Amino acid sequence: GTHSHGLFKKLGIPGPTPLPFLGNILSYHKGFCMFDMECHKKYGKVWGFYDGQQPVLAITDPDMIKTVLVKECYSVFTNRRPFGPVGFMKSAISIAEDEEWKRLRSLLSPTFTSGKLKEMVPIIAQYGDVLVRNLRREAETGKPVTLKDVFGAYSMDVITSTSFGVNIDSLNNPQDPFVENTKKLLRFDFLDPFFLSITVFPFLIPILEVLNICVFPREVTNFLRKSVKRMKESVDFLQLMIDSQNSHKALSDLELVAQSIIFIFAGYETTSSVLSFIMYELATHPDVQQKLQEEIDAVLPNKAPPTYDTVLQMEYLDMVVNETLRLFPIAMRLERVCKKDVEINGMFIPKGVVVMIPSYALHRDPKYWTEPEKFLPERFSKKNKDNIDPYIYTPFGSGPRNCIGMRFALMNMKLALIRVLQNFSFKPCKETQIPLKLSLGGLLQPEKPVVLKVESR
Amino acid sequence: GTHSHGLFKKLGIPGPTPLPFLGNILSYHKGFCMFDMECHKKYGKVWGFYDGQQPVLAITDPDMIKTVLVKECYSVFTNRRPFGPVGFMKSAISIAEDEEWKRLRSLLSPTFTSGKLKEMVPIIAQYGDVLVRNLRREAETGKPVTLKDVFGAYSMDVITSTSFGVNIDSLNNPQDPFVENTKKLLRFDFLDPFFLSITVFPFLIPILEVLNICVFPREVTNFLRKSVKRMKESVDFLQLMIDSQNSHKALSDLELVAQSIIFIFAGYETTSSVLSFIMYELATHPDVQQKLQEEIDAVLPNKAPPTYDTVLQMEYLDMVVNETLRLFPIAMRLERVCKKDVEINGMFIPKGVVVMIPSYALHRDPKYWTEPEKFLPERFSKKNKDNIDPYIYTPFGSGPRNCIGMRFALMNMKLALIRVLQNFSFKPCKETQIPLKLSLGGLLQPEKPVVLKVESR
Amino acid sequence: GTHSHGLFKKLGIPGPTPLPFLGNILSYHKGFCMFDMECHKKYGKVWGFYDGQQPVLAITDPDMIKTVLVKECYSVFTNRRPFGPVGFMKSAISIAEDEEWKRLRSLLSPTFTSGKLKEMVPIIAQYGDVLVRNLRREAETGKPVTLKDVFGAYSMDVITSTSFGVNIDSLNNPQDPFVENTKKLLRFDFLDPFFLSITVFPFLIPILEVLNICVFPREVTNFLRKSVKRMKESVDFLQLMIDSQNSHKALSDLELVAQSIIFIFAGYETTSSVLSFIMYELATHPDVQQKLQEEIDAVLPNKAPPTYDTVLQMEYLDMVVNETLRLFPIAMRLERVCKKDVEINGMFIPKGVVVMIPSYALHRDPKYWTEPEKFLPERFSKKNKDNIDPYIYTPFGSGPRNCIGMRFALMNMKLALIRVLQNFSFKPCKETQIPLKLSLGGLLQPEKPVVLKVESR
Amino acid sequence: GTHSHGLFKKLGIPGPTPLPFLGNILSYHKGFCMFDMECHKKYGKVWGFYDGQQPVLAITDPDMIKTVLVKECYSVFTNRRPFGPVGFMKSAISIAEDEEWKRLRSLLSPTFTSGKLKEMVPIIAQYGDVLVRNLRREAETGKPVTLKDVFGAYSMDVITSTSFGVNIDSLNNPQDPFVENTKKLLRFDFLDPFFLSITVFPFLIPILEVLNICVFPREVTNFLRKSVKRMKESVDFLQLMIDSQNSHKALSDLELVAQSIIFIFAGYETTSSVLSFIMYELATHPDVQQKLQEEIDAVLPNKAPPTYDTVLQMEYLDMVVNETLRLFPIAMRLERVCKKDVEINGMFIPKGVVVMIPSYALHRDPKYWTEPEKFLPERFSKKNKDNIDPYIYTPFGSGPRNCIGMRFALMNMKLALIRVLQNFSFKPCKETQIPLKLSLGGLLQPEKPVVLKVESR
Numbered sequence A, B, C, D: 001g002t003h004s005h006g007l008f009k010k011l012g013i014p015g016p017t018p019l020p021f022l023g024n025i026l027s028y029h030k031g032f033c034m035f036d037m038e039c040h041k042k043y044g045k046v047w048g049f050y051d052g053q054q055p056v057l058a059i060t061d062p063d064m065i066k067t068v069l070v071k072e073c074y075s076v077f078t079n080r081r082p083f084g085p086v087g088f089m090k091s092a093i094s095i096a097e098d099e100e101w102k103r104l105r106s107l108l109s110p111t112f113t114s115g116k117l118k119e120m121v122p123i124i125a126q127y128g129d130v131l132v133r134n135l136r137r138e139a140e141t142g143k144p145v146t147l148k149d150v151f152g153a154y155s156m157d158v159i160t161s162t163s164f165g166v167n168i169d170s171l172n173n174p175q176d177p178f179v180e181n182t183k184k185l186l187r188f189d190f191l192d193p194f195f196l197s198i199t200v201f202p203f204l205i206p207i208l209e210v211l212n213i214c215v216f217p218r219e220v221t222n223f224l225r226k227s228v229k230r231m232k233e234s235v236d237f238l239q240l241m242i243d244s245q246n247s248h249k250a251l252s253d254l255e256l257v258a259q260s261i262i263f264i265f266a267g268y269e270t271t272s273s274v275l276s277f278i279m280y281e282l283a284t285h286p287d288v289q290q291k292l293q294e295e296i297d298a299v300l301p302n303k304a305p306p307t308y309d310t311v312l313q314m315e316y317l318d319m320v321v322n323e324t325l326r327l328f329p330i331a332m333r334l335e336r337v338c339k340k341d342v343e344i345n346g347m348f349i350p351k352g353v354v355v356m357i358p359s360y361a362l363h364r365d366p367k368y369w370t371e372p373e374k375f376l377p378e379r380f381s382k383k384n385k386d387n388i389d390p391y392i393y394t395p396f397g398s399g400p401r402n403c404i405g406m407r408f409a410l411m412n413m414k415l416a417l418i419r420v421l422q423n424f425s426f427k428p429c430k431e432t433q434i435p436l437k438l439s440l441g442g443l444l445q446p447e448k449p450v451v452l453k454v455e456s457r
């Protein structure tokens, strides 16, 4: 039961010692984030562990991180860890591999350009107003608001109308067929019962794929696949893709449905979780919240509606976002499969190892960050935005295979915050978890949901 | 690839010849019902086929059927075909085996007595009124009603309030947390992609059970399991069970949740489908519908509300129900695992064969029924209700392991029909499928749903 | 990954704490024997552990052992742990279950009677002479003999000629087709790579059975199955079985081949291993060897050939055999599946637990045996053969399902020893492992094989 | 159950229609060879079928064959069909993939050069004499010789002494530890029970690999792996490899054991089967046998021993060998996995299709061969050795990935024949199967083994 459990002692790379079959997964009982810090402390800058029989080589040196993520990306480190069972979602850009991915990353890049984004801002802006009106209704009546629902509803109101042209007040219309399905599109908990069973028996993935079982539910996907058929057959992501097949080989039909779904998956709980973390930090730091409220009113006098250009104007906002993402990189880790034998920056890495960059832990490394547990938006000021190594702070990853939706994600979250801070202020409650505790699960998210008092300005 | 594909040629039992691995499942392309008639025609009164490597021995002789279902039930033919993956639903009475089942069938029988049923009629009767008001709203406005929704909603309005004490206008409140889950509780299509893959690779069931995959969704069950915890901790099925553990070993906690779930599963789409089939036949036979409307008004003058006793009074109603069930035994087949070697009525049956009684086909046998394709409620008159062999007409099966919910099912459906016929009459539409065609799937149900015109009296 | 890992803490039974998926198997790294002593020491007289997800309840009280092995044998504890993949060897008496086993234990019992055995002694006796002549050839030339080969060859020379009528000097004819196959029939190492993988993924057994993979090699079995066809079609086990189908249902054809194979498996390495252990103890205790040589010459003056009756006459011989089996019960454990819920001697045992009696450890319990590490044949004298509890000393198990081949095994080993001690004396070598160390594997057998000097008398 | 069973109807490529799960394997009941001719007849020059869910695209045009085997070999068609479970034999040159294979094909090519072969001829020649003396012993006594044993023994006598330096008269020493193992190294019957079960459930391969089950037996490999350790640590293949790691990365240790094993596998039953087929054809064509006997005596007057150079001198010999290989290409098919999307000679081939060249059938195509059922060595005369398309006659395949052992195989077989024809003549028997019938199994080999009369000259 120990296939390749000698690999790291052989190469002389240090690490914790594995059990048979389980490898090191018993050590995930405190989450990846906590597991990654301990190993950074113990074994220094490079170590290895086993997810089952799967060797994983952690790296924390920025020259070496760059070679993985940037330089040898097309040659050696092109794909993320095999992830299954996936069905037709094998065509989604984030699961596809090698040349199929390159084709798709090309076919979809001109959809995430600044120009196309600047054209999407009016759509996104309209569900800001929906959010505020869904918030004043919460704030008028004395009652502690649970952010995850009001924000979770907002990330939906945008995902839909930006990648299908569908305009829903999902909070107020929780039953439009569309709203049920797409809310079943949550990020995957890789320490939940199933995915841990996949790591111990990845020989079961082919079995599951054959049994037509999918991690992307077999019923959600069936609804959207035809719903797009009704859309196609009659300034958003779906349209910009339909264009990119009125010309690599143009995006097929099913290939298009796959991207739209993977966009929801990659965008829904990511955005919602970060918006929450930001409001938690503004609430538990009233000075920061006021300084930002003041910067918002300056650029936008008279509760003016935010634009693409006035969003890019506001620097304290940028610093708050970026500092929140430093504390809470909701990906936790970046990973690439090493598909040859290589020697990068003087270390031999055998074929088939998963190379892993422990973001969460590097973002909270005392060796690159002073007082790294503190919400301190000033590390990202124009004065200090220079002593920050872009291969240590990677909330969206780096390289050709980084977050294709980064500018969208950051513009989306910034408009929300702008309109919400314009109108309301956020004070803690007694029930607000202080200090916040992170779920020991496989998702970077708060143990207990964030609830705060909302008052109107 | 042919383990035991010689068994039936060895014993001298005739049948169609199997492919390797698939056995005879390619022959299910016209549904079990159509497959069963052909084999009855061809090979006579006893034949054998293979579901994968699983031999199944069909029988159509009533002395022999009785031995299986009645006599040697506890000794030889106690359990239905192994059905998985099931998780904790292995404790449901209909999936449990041998002594566990006997314990449960005992612990739950005094819940389906006439006395307890007669006490449940007022509850059931109240969602009759909900049904009619949900129907007049359909009938006031000129528009063809699709029965499956108005009736499907009714079977829900009763399942809930009779096995949990929860009172929902599920049609008008399609969002009460309770209504979403319990509507995901549909009968299993055993010719759908998954269950056919189970028949070819039943060696995959243990794998699925270990991966914590369930045929009873892992999320529906999680909602109900605690929802009962809130119910327990503060004249219906749930209460009568809570009593039966204030005393075999009293029903455990989880064992109770299992029964309530299996009741929904066994009762929801069964009832809805039969109510539809009955309305289809009343609509396409206006003479029968009028004769029954007339019998209803007699017993219940002035749109009087039906009672337990006036339901049992109405004989034409009984004949319509029973004749509909003859045409549409929504189970199609009865099955028992042969758990020893035996010789019943002079035939050797080896251990491990699935013995199967082809209800649908026997109900439409020209050899026991004249003009067996015709809706003819008079075969069930007190004059002819005698020339009917109870081992040929088995819409609820026979023996210790027949439908524990039979009197409930028949009383439930009869109250619906009574109140609906009192107030409305049902005429076809142009879009009404005539003749009705049965879905070639694994469920006895109409290809196209039943839509009819509803007019008010 | 912890299905039923709470069962023993729930019932209040103590034990070591399990890892997920692995249960306690990491604790088998010192063999079952050493694992069983520690648990006897620690948790007292009853404890529980997990082979994967499989709970196993150890018991060491003789009233309770008797209920399991003797009283409730037909009712509750009929079968040994499911053992697979087995193919047609599911018909072997030792793997078959419930009524199939009862049928076979009946059909084969009159083959292991004293009368039939007494008729087999001349056959067995002839390969005594073959053994001695294969030994004098070893002893004439100065060279340390490795017992396992000379004895292993003898157990073969008897297995063949007693269950097929085939007369081979397997040592001198190591190529007769028959000799190759039947030497591939070794007892199963349940801590070897494969069987440990079965305990962690017993959901893989059905898969293996379907892939036609067998633990009883698919080629050895193919040779014997037809070799018996040539035998049948033209005073030993094969003949006595062919008779028992010239009359429960008479033994089928394949059922007969299965028993003959399972006899080889159960008899080959068992006998060889015990004969070795006995010679080791005679060699490292020269007083015992001389006292037995002297008893042999008395009963059999002049190197007389042993008979059935003079074998039963020799009591010191009996004591040496029985005391060797106390130190080395080559089964180590006895096991029965608990197939209902029960309460035996005031302990609840849930359905599906494997109940296990730790022979090796009880035989070396200081609480029933003084100086239990010492070879002391006198504990079995007619004076002390009474203070010995037959449910503590179970080298062949007890009850209806004990070793059907016991009298044969004991008569077989005794004739070997008699003829070998008549002619030779056995002195250690420098290379003789002293003290003997037991293999930490899954078989009770010496780490290093036994080599001793043989000199002629 | 029909993943990608539409691919060939979609692309417009014709073929037989598949069953679910089985694809077309029911059509293998007459062997690949017979299946391939029918499809060549029916669908013309390009067709498609399914091995399970695995699409296979047959091609029979020589420009297109060349692109697959020669041109786009490194780019598109580098590997043979995934074949498992393989364990460490994944390092054998013939199973390894992509760059690992290129490394190995380089590291091992200078071992199959003419120069190295010419140095191996004296070794090979010595077991010619062993063969003849093992043959005169057969021919002196009047008795029909079964070629497969005398020749099978010869191919062993050479495999050993050319790839390990071990000199065995395996016929006369059938027990040297070495001889038992290496005779268990037979070519794989891909229509036997197991491998057909692999084609239907290739999702079971990962399971088997994890269970440590190997198609290259787990015991044969264990013997050789250490036997080489004794060899290494103290003019043949093993030595030439030990050199090639006294310098791509030099051949590792285990990588060397793997090649030696794969050499036995690729060389043992191949050579034996072809030598038989040649003797069958010489015996059933006495004119050819005499004309070759006469050519042998010319070049080698006085039963002179054959040399490397006099072997290359004899042209009728070449024609007999080459014409036998035309009738019996013991590979039957060549295959390459299509690892991108491509268009070769104007046909689109999707990623993941197995491209297959049906050698056996092309060699017996009436469209490239007149009277293609006839043993006619003259088609290979220097006059006609030109009208023969090297992509139609491919008994060793073509391209960078053709038979690395071709010159060895052809020199080996030619020396055997030379020395055997020098001394003996071969006449049929009454028991000689005439006409020869090919086994309908998955190996190209005679149904009934070849037996002929051997007389001495």
Ligand code: HEM
Binding pocket: A093, A094, A095, A105, A262, A263, A266, A267, A270, A271, A274, A330, A331, A334, A335, A394, A395, A396, A397, A398, A399, A400, A401, A402, A403, A404, A405, A406, A408, A409
């Ligand atoms: C706060 C919000 C978000 C965060 C923190 C985030 C973060 C990330 C990270 C860390 C990765 C892995 C990159 C790598 O491997 O280096 C990733 C990949 C990706 N994200 Fe985002 N993301 C967010 C929102 C979005 C949105 C709105 C989209 C909309 C299209 C999106 C689409 C994707 C895609 C398609 C990939 C995979 C791209 C590829 O594999 O080529 N994400 N994201």
Ligand code: HEM
Binding pocket: B093, B094, B095, B105, B262, B263, B266, B267, B270, B271, B274, B330, B331, B334, B335, B394, B395, B396, B397, B398, B399, B400, B401, B402, B403, B404, B405, B406, B408, B409
């Ligand atoms: C028209 C409505 C229904 C029909 C036609 C129907 C029919 C059947 C049939 C044919 C069986 C198999 C019996 C056998 O194997 O002989 C069965 C079993 C069963 N039904 Fe019904 N049923 C209906 C409604 C219900 C309802 C309302 C319940 C509510 C509790 C219920 C609970 C069960 C249970 C628990 C079993 C299995 C009992 C056991 O295995 O011991 N069914 N039903």
Ligand code: HEM
Binding pocket: C093, C094, C095, C105, C262, C263, C266, C267, C270, C271, C274, C330, C331, C334, C335, C394, C395, C396, C397, C398, C399, C400, C401, C402, C403, C404, C405, C406, C408, C409
């Ligand atoms: C020193 C030699 C032997 C020893 C120590 C030995 C010991 C054992 C033990 C401990 C068991 C388990 C009994 C139980 O579960 O209580 C057993 C079962 C069995 N043994 Fe022996 N045995 C020996 C030789 C033989 C021989 C020569 C045969 C020849 C037929 C044989 C045939 C069997 C069979 C068939 C069973 C299973 C019976 C059943 O399951 O009903 N054994 N043996």
Ligand code: HEM
Binding pocket: D093, D094, D095, D105, D262, D263, D266, D267, D270, D271, D274, D330, D331, D334, D335, D394, D395, D396, D397, D398, D399, D400, D401, D402, D403, D404, D405, D406, D408, D409
């Ligand atoms: C009559 C005897 C033989 C015949 C007919 C034969 C035929 C073949 C064929 C058809 C192939 C597939 C080539 C392709 O895919 O194009 C092959 C591959 C191969 N053969 Fe032979 N062979 C014979 C003897 C040998 C011998 C003696 C060796 C000794 C080393 C050998 C080693 C190999 C190897 C290693 C491969 C795979 C090479 C690679 O995949 O790169 N074969 N053979």
Ligand SMILES: C/C(=C/COc1c2ccoc2cc2oc(=O)ccc12)CC[C@H](O)C(C)(C)O
Binding pocket: A032, A080, A081, A094, A095, A187, A188, A190, A262, A265, A266, A267, A270, A330, A331, A332, A333, A334, A335, A336, A442
């Ligand atoms: C190496 C990884 C990177 C995560 O890349 C994403 C992220 C990260 C946050 O949200 C995302 C949405 C995405 O959507 C997509 O389609 C594709 C990628 C994606 C896996 C992260 C695992 O959880 C853990 C903690 C076990 O390593």
